[PDB]
Amino acid sequence: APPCKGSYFGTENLKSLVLHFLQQYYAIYDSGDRQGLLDAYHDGACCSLSIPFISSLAEYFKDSRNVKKLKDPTLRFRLLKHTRLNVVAFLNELPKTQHDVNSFVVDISAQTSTLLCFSVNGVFKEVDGKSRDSLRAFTRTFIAVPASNSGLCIVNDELFVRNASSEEIQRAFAMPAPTP
Amino acid sequence: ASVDFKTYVDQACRAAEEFVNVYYTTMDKRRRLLSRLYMGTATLVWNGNAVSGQESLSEFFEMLPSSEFQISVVDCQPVHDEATPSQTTVLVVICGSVKFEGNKQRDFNQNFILTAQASPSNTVWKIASDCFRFQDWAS
């Protein structure tokens, strides 16, 4: 039984590359206007959202895509946002957020001269709406290609949103006085 | 595009739903056959641990305790040509619970990239890259 470990970057250069990308991405994502992400997504990018099948996640329900449960090809097709315009327009409709970027657990699982796949695990708080202050947990998988600068250009983005567990909430909100 | 986008989306869903069924069925009831679902150069980042090569993957899988997976969420997307030139690939993301013998049931998230291998008979989809992590890996 291999011990579970934190973020896996493979190399220091990739760690710097991906963490920088994430800092810049979420600075825009949590800003109140996500249009700046248009520069982060490929013209033909894909984005889809999924949530648990099994504090409500009602605002994420309409766009949730679970192909194991939804069988209709047409509905499956429409639920997959395609082109940076539709991807970012959709993202800007989702609840405003505040992600704990520095606590992200990141796994870079694939890499070639044209591809980089990494998944981000963490939490984010909703800043307004009916679920104001709720803490959500998420796992987001990105596939990006090299960007004409030294950055990344996202071609695939799958976001899985769920409620944070009791243990996750306790850990995320704790701030006990220091003790020996 | 030379091929309609919806064609890629439909193909991605079919390949993903069927592969997921085979993958976890095999994981739970035919563990020794699991590594054959992977490409020779495939890697797996399991809870922050990198496992490289089909041979190492086979040993890793036989090393792990018996399992019982319950899959509840599957989503997938056709991967853009620019990321995998001349190679048809599909991103698959899974969420569910799993109980490994010797420990309590826990939720997990897994994502892998499948690659299409044309051949005499039908097209064969195999894992080129894999990533698995327990939602409560820290405990």
Show the 3-state SS of A26-54. Answer: HHHHCCCCHHHHHHCEEEEEEEEEECCCC
Cβ–Cβ contacts within 10 Å for residue A178, how many?
A: 4
> Do B109 and A160 count as a contact with CB atoms less than 8 A apart?
yes
> Cβ–Cβ contacts within 10 Å for residue B21, how many?
13
Q: Are B88 and B116 in contact (CB under 8 A)?
A: yes
Residues 6+ apart with CB under 8 A from B93: A50, A139, A141, A158, A160, B73, B74, B75, B76, B109, B110, B111
Chain A nearest-CA distance from B138, in A, is: 7
The structure's method of determination equals: X-ray
Q: Across B21-105, where does the E strand assignment appear?
A: 38-46, 49-52, 67-78, 89-100
What are the CA-CA distances from residue A60 to residues A7, A51, A159, B132 (Å)?
27, 7, 11, 24
Q: What is the CATH number of the domain that holds A46?
A: 3.10.450.50
CB contact under 8 A, B9 and A80: yes
What residues 30-59 of chain B have any CB closer than 8 A to a CB of chain A? 43-50
In this complex, do A67 and B75 lie within 8 Å of one another by their Cβ atoms? yes
Strand B106-117 vs strand A135-146: parallel, antiparallel, or unpaired? unpaired
Contacts of A141 in chain B (CB under 8 A): 91, 93, 111, 131
Chain B nearest CA to A5, separation (Å): 5
Cβ-defined contact of B95 to A52 (cutoff 8 Å): yes
CATH of the domain at B135: 3.10.450.50
DSSP class of B54: H
Residue positions counted in chain A: 180
Cα three-residue angle A50-B29-B34, rounded to 5 degrees: 70
The owner of tokens 């970057």 is A9
Backbone φ and ψ for B64, nearest 5 degrees, come out as: -65, 145
Nearest to B93 among A77, A141, A162 (CB): A141
Both tokens of residue B57?
A: 């993957």
Q: Any idea which residue has 């973020």 for tokens?
A: A7
Number of domains within chain B: 1
Element (H, E) at B115: strand B106-117
How many residues are given for chain B?
139
What's the distance, CA A27 to chain centroid?
A: 13
| Alpha carbon distance A152, B83 (integer Å) | 11
Return d(Cα A69, Cα A55) in angstroms, integer.
23
Nearest CA in chain B to A42: B80
For the residues of A147-177, what is the DSSP string, one character each? -TTSSEEEEEEEEEEEEPPHHHHHHHH--PP
Q: Is B76 on the interface with A (CB under 8 A)?
A: yes
Chain A: closest CA distance from residue B35 (Å):
17
Q: What are phi and psi of A79, to 5 degrees?
A: -75, -15
**What's A122's DSSP letter?**
E
List of residues 6+ apart from B25 with CB closer than 8 A: none
Answer yes or no: are the C-beta atoms of A19 and A6 closer than 8 Å.
no
| Nearest-Cα residue of chain B relative to residue A7 | B48
From the list A4, A53, A121, the residue facing B73 with the nearest CB is A53
Chain A CB contacts of B111 under 8 Å are: 109, 119, 139, 141, 158
A30, A91, B39 from A24: Cα distances, Å? 10, 16, 34
Whose tokens are 């490289």? That residue is B52
Query: Domain containing A30: what range?
Result: 1-180
The tokens of B33 are what?
Answer: 């056959």
Dihedral, A28, A29, A33, A37 alpha carbons, nearest 10: 70
Total domains present in chain A: 1
Tell me the residue type at A25: Y
Is B95's Cβ below 8 Å from some Cβ in A? Answer: yes
Q: Within 13 Å, how many C-alpha atoms sit on residue B38's CB side?
A: 26
By three-state DSSP, how is residue A60 classified?
helix
B137 is in which domain, residue-wise? 1-139
| Radius of gyration from C-alpha coordinates of chain A | 17
Distance CA B16, CA B7 (A): 14
Quickly tell me which residue has 């990198």 as its tokens.
B50
- Integer Cα distance of A45 and B130 in angstroms: 21
DSSP run (H or E) holding A22: helix A12-29
Contacts of A170 (CB under 8 A, 6+ apart): none
